[PDB]
Design an enzyme around this catalytic site. Structure first.
Site, PDB file in Angstrom:
ATOM      1  N   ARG A   5       0.822  -1.206   0.000  1.00 25.49           N
ATOM      2  CA  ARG A   5       0.000   0.000   0.000  1.00 25.49           C
ATOM      3  C   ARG A   5       0.858   1.259   0.000  1.00 25.49           C
ATOM      4  O   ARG A   5       0.526   2.244  -0.670  1.00 25.49           O
ATOM      5  CB  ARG A   5      -0.947  -0.010   1.199  1.00 25.49           C
TER       6      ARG A   5
ATOM      7  N   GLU B 235     -13.709 -13.860  11.577  1.00 28.47           N
ATOM      8  CA  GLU B 235     -13.627 -13.466  10.173  1.00 28.47           C
ATOM      9  C   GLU B 235     -13.362 -14.705   9.330  1.00 28.47           C
ATOM     10  O   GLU B 235     -12.201 -15.061   9.074  1.00 28.47           O
ATOM     11  CB  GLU B 235     -12.545 -12.413   9.947  1.00 28.47           C
TER      12      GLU B 235
ATOM     13  N   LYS C 115     -17.166 -11.094  10.996  1.00 26.40           N
ATOM     14  CA  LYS C 115     -16.564 -10.335   9.901  1.00 26.40           C
ATOM     15  C   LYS C 115     -16.590 -11.200   8.650  1.00 26.40           C
ATOM     16  O   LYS C 115     -15.561 -11.736   8.222  1.00 26.40           O
ATOM     17  CB  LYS C 115     -15.139  -9.901  10.246  1.00 26.40           C
TER      18      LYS C 115
ATOM     19  N   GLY D 211     -13.311  -6.821   1.067  1.00 29.93           N
ATOM     20  CA  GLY D 211     -13.123  -7.923   0.143  1.00 29.93           C
ATOM     21  C   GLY D 211     -12.790  -7.491  -1.268  1.00 29.93           C
ATOM     22  O   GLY D 211     -13.350  -8.034  -2.228  1.00 29.93           O
ATOM     23  N   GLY D 212     -11.905  -6.508  -1.420  1.00 28.65           N
ATOM     24  CA  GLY D 212     -11.397  -6.156  -2.730  1.00 28.65           C
ATOM     25  C   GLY D 212     -12.301  -5.308  -3.590  1.00 28.65           C
ATOM     26  O   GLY D 212     -12.049  -5.187  -4.792  1.00 28.65           O
TER      27      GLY D 212
END
Lengths: 343, 343, 343, 343
Positions: free
Chosen positions: B41, B186, B228, B271-272
């Site tokens: 990132r 999750e 999650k 989730g993208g």
């Protein structure tokens, strides 16, 4: 991958039936009783068990006046009751539909012992259940009943008993849904023994979690199913006393921890408690401050018919009296289902 | 029998923390990026991955103005972020508490391959998790994160992968609850492949049913847990297009069929998907006509920080610009959490 | 479908190692004791727990004369023992190989409590177990040990404990096999309590069936594994007495009902019985008329070292005496492994 | 705790029956065929299917000359065959006992579809199975047969199918053992499709591991059971050719990895292979260098009766010809069972 157990039309039909059964203010009259199961109830009066006596008793339960219609959303019938007729020649399933109810059938064939267990039993009735369920669907039955019996002991229920009962319930649900019949999953936990409310709640949570895991494993459409759990109550031999609010809190907590919200409604069984006690417990459950995503209705065999049976006395003179007792009990139970029952 | 995993005081504390995290209008800021996870990132801009750079970026995410307080109910931090401080010397957990948020920590130690599976992985991090969770509790972390990664293939997820991920999630939840930390379960399902919405929903239902069966098996207090899950969405390579309403219907249906209502809230992950897409999908999920017994909040890592990172550019001049962008995105996500997001 | 966890070369290597460990007449010396685990054993003599003391004791165990070579097929070492050296500078793993033995390592990181259970524990150590096992393979360790602890109580072992221990054993076995290390599955059942031989056999059968089901689920190559089960014996507090033949019959019956023959060998642990008792029980097990498809060898921590510690006394003068005592005990245990031990 | 499913006397009786069935040199004649199942076989000649035709064919199979006595250790009969008599008036079960064989009965009531699966089926027949098994025990049947059908597809067998078939097999075994009848567990895997030997072996290992885990869960006495697995063979549509030695190695490896040695014997089914091929495969299985702790016998429906049916031709003139053909085939299969078959 994902092989659809039910088409969208089948799912819609099952959801419609299930929501009709547990529509707000409506519950289930568990009129299903085997020849020997109703034999003890008829012997409590002294009246002999015959075909005509059984037919008249079930007609008395089913031919009540118009005040029962918005309170009974479903009626579970025995195999012979589904094919008996009213005095005017109207079939019992058609009598149930004419009153706005949904016709149900008990499809389980009793409980059989589980070897290696402490008196634990599993329920049979899966043989030819597809053909039986299809025939019941053609005979007016829109939902089915399967009573799985578990009890609480020092080593009971075991892993084998819970797993097998959940598996057989899931198979029965799969068969019923494939045949267009809403399956009522009943993992009943007997209130027998000195176990307290905490142990009953723990056992109920474990049993219901296993039951719904099995339902997921068998690709059961939960919106087309209803649950028939025992009220989380202390055992009959339990010395410690719990209030109706405590029982309601325990039951709602057990249901919220296990039951997915997709289940259309939860139809409690009496489980050996009196009519007034069952109605008050249902009212407290529906008055529980915890958020309840399902229809917490009633499916009572003894809590709806004990007073009617006592009043009837096996003779035709008390037809009206027994019908009135059953009707007032159904009114009370519907009020409890809506949470507005004040005795 | 029933051995209480948690005392009533521990259950009350866990429920209080969980309800604080997903209080209405509030969601979760997922700042739980490892050194290598945030490396990509930070390389998207061209700014080097540095302890000071990571500290400044997380301070920028955390030291936003007062209007982000009622939109963020929790922040998940990395291990090093829990022990960094703001520019004024205020520790990051104390910065989170001062804004009304709940401090969280990512306690999983990454995913490891599962042998005999088609690239399937299971998540490690249970070693010394009790001591780690206790220390995190003393350091301000009131909830934990554990990312279990599943994907959809021609033979994936398999029984072994789902079972192992559910078991490890249940163990992590048990450890966290024993240490007074709310576990966020999750069971993320990767949106990788050409699988459609139906297959994603089926896989999500199976995974969530197994996860909650494992949680029941491990005596997990579901009121002290949060979920999650991946939004039920088609795969990234899926050619067929699905509307936000269809995605919301599928996600809510999958949650209602598997998640018990006792779960305090459901905190979706991106989730993208893009920030606007994630916010719109969350809004549609909260606008779903199906009854939703849980807080359907957001726990977004990329959907909450992607535009803030792009605006920041790695230089101190765009500090305020990144604050503004992240704050507006958190406001939008809170509106979606309440179902009132209209872009 | 079928995704091969191990290539045929890896399977061949694991089978070769496993058959080398439990070659006829050969057993395992369990020399793996943590700093605190060996602290009590060294305090029973009166000698302090010291790195040099630990190294000298393990050298005494490992530098025995040539009469131990055909009796010891494997040695399980602690992490620090794998990197200690003999007096002549020879590394301990190389000392083990030079004697024909197979170097082993204890890879589990201890037991941790299971919440909601009656004192039941699960074993940790899966974090970074792949890298640890790879390093141990480069350091000479060809097999690994993972001690999963179960006990027998009025409600113990529960379904959760057995399931979780089997799952963690299967994961450890998968990691070890992926790293070329033979996993020794040890679902030890504590002989603590007043439970009789029948209950111990039933619990052992259930635990081993669950363990091998988990191994199948995790795609474990059973020919590249060994089993370290508790001998089916009555509890330490059990009043009823059982002969060595009865214990052997119960143990062999429990193994034959659960363990598949593909398992290369079964290496029993002493489990708190005396040296002579352990040797006699192993001899009776190998003399059991029931057909035994596996190598029923020994993997003894205390049953091979108690007399060695007693003779040694913590001082260098009794080096030869302790070596001789350990050697004679190893010869006796090898004879029991072959079924020819007559005290 | 440990609640004994069977008393030591019941276990001894079951072990005696099971060892009698698979005594060395003896196998099983699978003469069980439904009215429609044998209808296709009788139509292959052109002879009509009647009660008398079925009775004469089964008498031919059962009243063979004395040279078939040490080759047949058991005969599985259909429900109607158990109650038919020979030409001299001797009942068929008594005919079987008089020849040294053990009378068996097909107790399963066919396969039913599993919803949500890719054509997968589960076997019914548990309703009243206790009463049926008790009656069969009074009618001479000492063991039972339950055919569970699994096939191999791109997503098949699924977890639900394997789990349900294992559960129903375990329930059938429990009922049979409670009724004193040795259960033959048949988790048949259809050789339909293009799957190779490796995938068939993988599926067989998974199915057998689940089956024996279910048997352990249901407290099945494995010494009083027999296994009827499919030979690990490539699918009928598989292009790759495998030698008899390769098939034998795969089958023995799959059995050794999943079947516990306590199982008294393994009685293979033909699975759609020719008589000579089935006998050669059984011989190669018994000649496999891997150690085989069980009696690897035969239980052949078509591999023992195809040539006899062809020779008979539905007319009484070829009675002796079909006798000789079936007897020679049974002698060949017994030789294969002992590993001494050289065609």
């Amino acid at each position: 991958h994902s092989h659809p157990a039910l088409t969208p039309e089948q799912k819609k039909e099952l959801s419609d039936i299930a929501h009709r059964i547990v529509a707000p203010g409506k519950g289930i009259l568990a009129a299903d009783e085997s020849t020997g199961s109703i034999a003890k109830r008829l012997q409590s009066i002294g009246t002999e068990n015959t075909e005509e006596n059984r037919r008249f008793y079930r007609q008395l339960l089913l031919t009540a006046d118009d005040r029962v219609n918005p309170c009974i959303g479903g009626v579970i019938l025995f195999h012979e009751t589904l094919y008996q007729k009213a005095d005017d020649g109207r079939p019992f399933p058609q009598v149930i539909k004419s009153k706005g109810g949904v016709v149900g059938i008990k499809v389980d064939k009793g409980v059989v012992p589980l070897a290696g267990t402490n008196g634990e039993t599993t329920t049979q009735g899966l043989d030819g259940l597809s053909e039986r369920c299809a025939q019941y669907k053609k005979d007016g039955a829109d939902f089915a009943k399967w009573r799985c019996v578990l009890k609480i002991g020092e080593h009971t229920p075991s892993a084998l008993a819970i797993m097998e009962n959940a598996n057989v319930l899931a198979r029965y649900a799969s068969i019923c849904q494939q045949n267009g019949i809403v399956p009522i999953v009943e993992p009943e936990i007997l209130p027998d023994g000195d176990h307290d409310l905490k142990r009953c709640q723990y056992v109920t949570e474990k049993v219901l979690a296993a039951v719904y895991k099995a339902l997921s494993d068998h690709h059961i459409y939960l919106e087309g199913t209803l649950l028939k759990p025992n009220m989380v109550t202390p055992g009959h031999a339990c010395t410690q006393k719990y209030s109706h609010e405590e029982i309601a809190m325990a039951t709602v907590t057990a249901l919220r921890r296990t039951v997915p919200p997709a289940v259309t409604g939860v139809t409690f069984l009496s489980g050996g408690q009196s009519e007034e006690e069952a109605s008050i417990n249902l009212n407290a459950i529906n008055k529980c401050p915890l958020l309840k995503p399902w229809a917490l209705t009633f499916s009572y065999g003894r809590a709806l018919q004990a007073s009617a049976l006592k009043a009837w006395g096996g003779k035709k003179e008390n037809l009206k009296a027994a019908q009135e007792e059953y009707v007032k009990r159904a009114l009370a139970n519907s009020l409890a289902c809506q949470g507005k029952y004040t005795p």
